[PDB]
Design a protein around this ligand. Structure first.
Ligand SMILES: O=N[O-]
Ligand SMILES: O=N[O-]
Ligand SMILES: O=N[O-]
Ligand SMILES: O=N[O-]
Ligand SMILES: O=N[O-]
Ligand SMILES: O=N[O-]
Ligand SMILES: [Cu+2]
Ligand SMILES: [Cu+2]
Ligand SMILES: [Cu+2]
Ligand SMILES: [Cu+2]
Ligand SMILES: [Cu+2]
Ligand SMILES: [Cu+2]
Lengths: 333, 333, 333
C-alpha cells in the first residue's frame, strides 16, 4: 500500500493518568496517527521526605503519556531530544515489529530528532520505553517508559464476544526506582549522570527498589489528584510496569474483566481480586462501580503499596447500596 | 429484598488446614450465613530454632479459618476484639464490594465488637485480611489474613462445563514474616508493639522475608499434621498469599484443574506443574491422586520452600501403579 | 499392558539450545523412549569477569538437555553418576506421577547408576531437576535442571483447534546462581562442597541471585552462538526456570502463541509482549518472524537481563518490510 494515500490524524497527548480523546470503535478506515514527544531530563521529587532524583522522561512525565490507536493503523512518532538534555535516548515500542521495537532506528543525541513509523498489527496495551544499548535498565528505571493502546477496530469484547464499552479510562504507570544508598542507608547524591552511573548500576543490582510509585511520586494519585468515578460507570484502568512485576488490586472492588498481560484477542479473566502484570508488560482491567466512597488502588504487595509508594485513590460519587454491604452493628463495647 | 425473610445458618469454623462442612451444590436458596471470629494477639513459635513472634490472628490461627458460602448468599460476620488484646483491628474481604472490602466499617478497639454483612456476588476463593489505616502491611504480615470461598450455586465446573466434585478440601495459607534482624543477622526482640513498629517497617522494606511458612510455622503440615488422601480421591487445595507471590507445586503430582487466580467463572488451567498465585490472591487446584506415598507440597522457589519454610507433606494411601512409574533397575554399582 | 510388547527407540541427546530430532505429529503408536544421561560435576566460568563455580550438571551442560516424547509414551531414563563425581544425585520429572517425580527412586551415589521408567500422561513442557532430600535448592541452583517436552500425539494446536507447526525449536534454560559474597561484596571461594554448603545456604537465603543466565553463562547465546532464523520461519522457544520466576520477551517481536505455564491442553495466549513463567515451570512461545536483523531475547526485568545476564540474541536473515516499520526521518539535527 501507498501509505501516502491514507488519512493522517495528529494526536495531541495529555499527561497521565488522563488519556487523549479517541474512539473505541473505529470511525474511519486505517490511518497514519501522528504523535510527537519531546524528551525531558529533569529533577523530580518522588516522596514525602523530599528525595529528588534525575528523571528521564518522555514529554515531561513519569510515566510517559498513553498513546491510543487502532489495529492496523500506522503510528508515526516524531521524537525530539533537545539540546538542553545531556544524554542519548531512543524508543522501543513493544507494539511494533522489527529493529528492537524501534530502538535501533531512533537513537537521538541532544539536539537531534527522528521520525519512526510502524504498523500496529496486534491489539492490546503495550509498554514503550527508552533502550540505549548498554544503558537500558538505567533509562527505564529513571522513568523513561509509558504505554500504547492498540484497540481492536470494533472495540473491546467480553469472554462471550459481546461488547464492553468503557465510560472513562485512566493510565496508571508504576515505576520502580533504585536510589543509591550509602552503607548507613541514606540516599546518596550525585553531580553528573556519568558520576552517578556506577552507583546506579550497583543499586539496581540489589533488585530491591527504594521507591515504587504511581504517576511518578508517592501520593501522586491521591488528594486533589485522586481518580474519580460515579456509581454505575464503567472504567478501564490501563496499568504498566516496564521493568518489574506488579499485582494490581482495587480495594473495595474487583477487575470485572481483566487482560492481565494486556492483549485483547484473548478473552479476559473474570472477577479478579488481584492479577499479575509481569515486568515489561501493560495490562488492563475493566470495572463497573457499584458503591460510592474512597477506594485504594494498589500493588497488593502491601509493603510495596503502603511503605514504598504503590498506592492511589479513587473517589466515587453516588448512592450507597445496603443490600451489597452494610454495617449491621457498628463498632461498640 | 428484605433480607430478614431469608434463612439464617450459623457456621462453626474449624482450624486450618481443615475446612468447615458445606455443600458444593447449594441445597437451599440464598441464605444469610453467620460467622463469628474472635481476634487473638498471641506469641507464636514459627521455626525449629524457637524464634517467637507476636502474631495477630483471626480465631487463634495463622492463617485465619476458611469461610465457605455460595454465590449470592450474604456473609454476616461478628468480629470480636477482646480487651485482652492491645491493638485496633478490622477486616477487608476481597469477596465484598464497598468500604475497602469492609475495613472502613469494622474498626474495633480492644473491648469492642461489630457485625458486617455483605453480599457474595462473585464466585471464587478470595483473601480476607486486617487492614487498619496506616498500619496495613504490619497486620497482614503478622498473620492477620485468611480466605473465603464463594462456590457457584451448582458447584465447580471444568473447562467444558461438566462437573468437578472434590472428595476432600484443604486450605493452605502461606505467610511471609519479616522478623527484624540486627546487623550481624540475628533476630531482634521487642518489648511492646509500639517499640517494635519502626523495626518492623524497616524489616518489611527489605522485601526479603525471613520466614515463609504454611499454616503458621515451619513443618506445620508435616508429621502427624501431614495432609492425607487415598489413591483415586479428588482433592481441592485452596492456597492464599495475602501479601506476596507464590508458586505452588505438588511434588509427584500436578494441578489437574487450576484456578491460579481463584475465580470460578473462568475455565481452569489444565495439567499445571506449577502456577503463580499473585500476592493478594487466593487460588485453588484440583487433583485426583494416582499413586500412594509421600508427596511434598511447596512454593517452588525451592529456597523459599526448603530453607525458609514453605513446604508441607501429603501422605497418600493405596496401591502402587507400576505402569505409571517404576524403578526398572534400582540404584546399584 | 505388557510394556515389553511396545517399540523401543533410543534418543541421542544434543546440547542446548539445540534439541534432538523428533516428530511433532506422532508417526508411530506409543513407544518406550530410551534416554541416558551422565551426571557431571564440573567447574564453569559464568561471567565476563571470570567467576568460576562448581556446577552440577546433567550431561555436562547448564541447562541439561531437552528430552522430547509424545503423550502416553513411556520415558525410560538411565541415569549414571560416575565415580569421578563426589555427591549423591537423583532426578525429579515434573512430567511424571509418583515418588516425588522420580526422586525417591533414583538416588545414585558416585559409582552407581539407575533406570527409571514413567508414563508421560500429560502434554506440555515440564521442568526436570535433581532433588536430593535436604539439599534440594543447592543442587537446583548449581545448574542441575533441564526440561522435557511431551507433545500431543497430533502436534500443537492454536486457540481454535487448527494446527501450529514449528520450523525450528530452541531450548532456553535460565539459571539463577547465588555465588556467596563476603561483606565487601566479592565472591568467596571454597575448597570442597561440604566447606561451601553453609555459605551456599546463606547466599540462597538472601533470595537475590548474583547471576541470572541463559545456557549457563553471560553471553552464551550471543555472537557465534546467537540463535538464528529467517523471515517467515515459525520458531518455538521453550524456556524453563526451575527455581525462580522469569518474564521472557523477544525484543522486536512477540509471542504469537504462548503457553506461559507450558501445558498444551490449554489454549495459548495470543500476541504476548511478555509472559510470566513461574519458578518451577517450563513455558513455550511460538513466533513467526516478520523482519530480519538482530533481536534480543530477555527476561524483561531489564536489570536481570542486562546487568545479571539473562539476555540472548537472535540473528534473523531476510528482507526488510518497510510497511511494518521504517525510519521516516533518520536521526538528525
Ligand atoms: O485489600 N486491601 O488491602
Ligand atoms: O493477554 N491477555 O490478557
Ligand atoms: O519438584 N520438586 O521440587
Ligand atoms: O481466576 N481464575 O483462575
Ligand atoms: O524491549 N526491550 O527491552
Ligand atoms: O499451561 N498453559 O499455558
Ligand atoms: Cu533514555
Ligand atoms: Cu522492552
Ligand atoms: Cu489487625
Ligand atoms: Cu487486600
Ligand atoms: Cu544433584
Ligand atoms: Cu520441582
Amino acid at each position: 500500500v501507498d501509505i501516502s494515500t491514507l488519512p493522517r490524524v495528529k494526536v495531541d497527548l495529555v499527561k497521565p493518568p488522563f488519556v487523549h480523546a479517541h474512539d473505541q470503535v473505529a470511525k474511519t478506515g486505517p490511518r497514519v496517527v501522528e504523535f510527537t514527544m519531546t524528551i525531558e531530563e529533569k529533577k523530580l521529587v518522588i516522596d514525602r521526605e523530599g528525595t529528588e532524583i534525575h528523571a528521564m522522561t518522555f514529554n515531561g512525565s513519569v510515566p510517559g503519556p498513553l498513546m491510543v490507536v487502532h489495529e492496523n493503523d500506522y503510528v508515526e512518532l516524531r521524537l525530539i531530544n533537545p539540546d538542553t538534555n545531556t544524554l542519548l535516548h531512543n524508543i522501543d515500542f513493544h507494539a511494533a515489529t522489527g529493529a528492537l521495537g524501534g530502538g535501533a532506528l531512533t537513537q537521538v543525541n541532544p539536539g537531534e530528532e527522528t521520525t519512526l513509523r510502524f504498523k500496529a498489527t496486534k491489539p492490546g496495551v503495550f509498554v514503550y520505553h527508552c533502550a540505549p544499548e548498554g544503558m537500558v535498565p538505567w533509562h527505564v528505571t529513571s522513568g523513561m517508559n509509558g504505554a500504547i493502546m492498540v484497540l481492536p477496530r470494533d472495540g473491546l469484547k467480553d469472554e462471550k464476544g459481546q461488547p464492553l464499552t468503557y465510560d472513562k479510562i485512566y493510565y496508571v504507570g508504576e515505576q520502580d526506582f533504585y536510589v543509591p544508598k550509602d552503607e548507613a542507608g541514606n540516599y546518596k547524591k550525585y553531580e553528573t549522570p556519568g558520576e552517578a552511573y556506577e552507583d546506579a548500576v550497583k543499586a539496581m543490582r540489589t533488585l530491591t527498589p527504594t521507591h515504587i510509585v504511581f504517576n511518578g511520586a508517592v501520593g501522586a494519585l491521591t488528594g486533589d489528584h485522586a481518580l474519580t468515578a460515579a456509581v454505575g460507570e464503567r472504567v478501564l484502568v490501563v496499568h504498566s510496569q516496564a521493568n518489574r512485576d506488579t499485582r494490581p488490586h482495587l480495594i473495595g472492588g474487583h477487575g470485572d474483566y481483566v487482560w492481565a498481560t494486556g492483549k485483547f484477542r484473548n478473552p479476559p479473566d473474570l472477577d479478579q481480586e488481584t492479577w499479575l502484570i509481569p515486568g515489561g508488560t501493560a495490562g488492563a482491567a475493566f470495572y463497573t462501580f457499584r458503591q460510592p466512597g474512597v477506594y485504594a488502588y494498589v500493588n497488593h504487595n502491601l509493603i510495596e503499596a503502603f511503605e514504598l509508594g504503590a498506592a492511589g485513590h479513587f473517589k466515587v460519587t453516588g448512592e450507597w447500596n445496603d443490600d451489597l454491604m452494610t454495617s449491621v452493628v457498628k463498632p461498640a463495647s
